[PDB]
Design a binder for this molecule. Structure first.
Ligand SMILES: [Cl-]
Ligand SMILES: [Cl-]
Lengths: 169, 169
């Protein structure tokens, strides 16, 4: 059955979190929407994007290339809805700003605003890691911007603990 | 409000689990019952017992000594209901077998049977650690024996992951 989220911790009335691998979650949860932490060219070469793409047996990359052929690059802060392949009904590819290449961190709000087009989502934090935002800040922008139901997966235990303790204690 | 368990993962219809510190859980959850992993003399010198006792500012040990003065030692597989102090309404002190001193592992069933006198409990796994049972086995005895609602706290992340993956995958 769809949207079978298990073992999440409520942070706010619409934001939940779990220490988990987003690919394993997608396969068990069968979400309506899984969010990808994308770049503007939808080149799924590492991180969450690479893991999602590999789990789709590269079908996500083939589809993404066809989308770029029609669209050109996405905007920073923008998104597109593509197939969820074997992971979800839909994949919402969202581009957060990459502060390490001089992009504007305020566009993280625009990135998360895209989640409001979907009633429930399985998602990673956006713009952290190689994109240079602080995960604590990214969680805050999510909490302040998303009003639909978001189930966040955080792979790293120490980071998960930092996010939860700082948020709730 | 009481029994405010958050972020647990359902293993069976009545057994739930979380990677958490049982003392921190008791203070946040305000459970009707917290289970102590006790010995027959209710000497709370280490492990969960020492942590619970320290959180009660030693009131648990004072009360326990008074109980032993009246009762003598508990039986292996037995229990007693004492105050929950500042952690819970009640503390169910349960003695699992210590296989390392030649006690009978089958009395782990008797230990968990005591949970059926309580509609909901916050509890640790019994008889593992210094008592020498395998945690995976202890979880199984819990699942097979307890029919009331049990919320298990496992402090160690690697052990938690082993327990959950082996149970559900
Ligand atoms: Cl929760
Ligand atoms: Cl669950």
């Amino acid at each position: 059955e769809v949207n079978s989220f298990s073992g999440y911790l409520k942070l706010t009335d619409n934001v939940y979190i779990k220490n988990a691998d987003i690919v394993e979650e997608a396969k068990k949860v069968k979400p309506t929407v899984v969010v990808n932490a994308a770049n503007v060219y939808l080149k799924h070469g590492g991180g969450v994007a690479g893991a999602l793409n590999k789990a789709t047996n590269n079908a996500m990359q083939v589809e993404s290339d066809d989308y770029i052929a029609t669209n050109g690059p996405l905007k920073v802060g923008g998104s597109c809805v593509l197939s969820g392949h074997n992971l979800a009904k839909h994949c919402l590819h969202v581009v957060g700003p990459n502060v390490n290449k001089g992009e504007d961190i305020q566009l993280l709000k625009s990135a998360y605003e895209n989640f409001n087009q979907h009633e429930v989502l399985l998602a990673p934090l956006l713009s952290a890691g190689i994109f240079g935002a602080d995960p604590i800040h990214s969680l805050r922008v999510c909490v302040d911007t998303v009003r639909t139901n978001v189930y966040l997966a955080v792979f790293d235990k120490n980071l998960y603990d930092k996010l939860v303790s700082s948020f709730l204690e």
